[PDB]
């Protein structure tokens, strides 16, 4: 699939394609493929539920999505979803201060962009994540950022990858009420790690800039921080190259 979706405040112009569904506050994707979004949506959620064997690309091509009850992007199931920031385009995602859970015992989603699965953010374009509820970009598996001009403002943690967080490129600017980057998988093999191999990263955080259980690696990157806690909190191993971690 290769679908185009355009929001104009309270109208949606979408291609008719397999598995795609547009409701009042929901664009639901259930088949693999590419989905390109643009325009302003006053109140909505992009919901991805395509199964653990399938992949999708969400191309943000100048979108401005607010959600008054939940996360603007919720990936319920995928093998992997890639988020692509279109060259020269301003993408803004704003979530609610308190999420409403239709099953009031659920606490997921809990991030402005939340994925139960692998997510990769890539591209030359711009992304601003206004995360009022909890975390900014969150996944129960591995978060990867390979590029983009990415600004996160988070009530809790900026980037949260339970499995891992990898940053190999991009211009990333994080403001967090707790940790800038947080990883917590104590369970799985070769998880619980933060790996920064490129890019420019600025972190202002009331607690730690990077908080990881098993490992933090930094090289060939420019990481500048301002923290209330520690620059790097990690009881595991630290492989940090000199001249990469500094103060903001
Ligand atoms: Gd309504
Ligand atoms: Gd696959
Ligand atoms: Gd598989
Ligand atoms: Gd509100
Ligand atoms: Gd460019
Ligand atoms: Gd309500
Ligand atoms: Gd549920
Ligand atoms: Gd329900
Ligand atoms: Gd998963
Ligand atoms: Gd690039
Ligand atoms: Gd993974
Ligand atoms: Gd922390």
UniProtKB/Swiss-Prot annotation:
Keywords: Calcium, Cell membrane, Lipoprotein, Membrane, Metal-binding, Palmitate, Signal. One of its GO terms (molecular function) is cellulose binding. This is Carbohydrate-binding domain-containing protein Cthe_2159. The lineage of its organism: Bacteria, Bacillati, Bacillota, Clostridia, Eubacteriales. Ca(2+) 3 binds at residues 179, 207-208, 211. The keyword Metal-binding applies. PROSITE patterns: PROKAR_LIPOPROTEIN (PS51257). The keyword Signal applies. It is a lipid-anchor. It comes from the Bacteria. Pfam families: Cthe_2159. Binds cellulosic and pectic substrates. Displays no enzyme activity (in vitro). Ca(2+) 1 binds at residues 116-117, 141. Coiled coil: none annotated. Its main location: membrane. Residues 88-189 are annotated as: Polygalacturonic acid-binding. One of its GO terms (cellular component) is plasma membrane. Monomer.
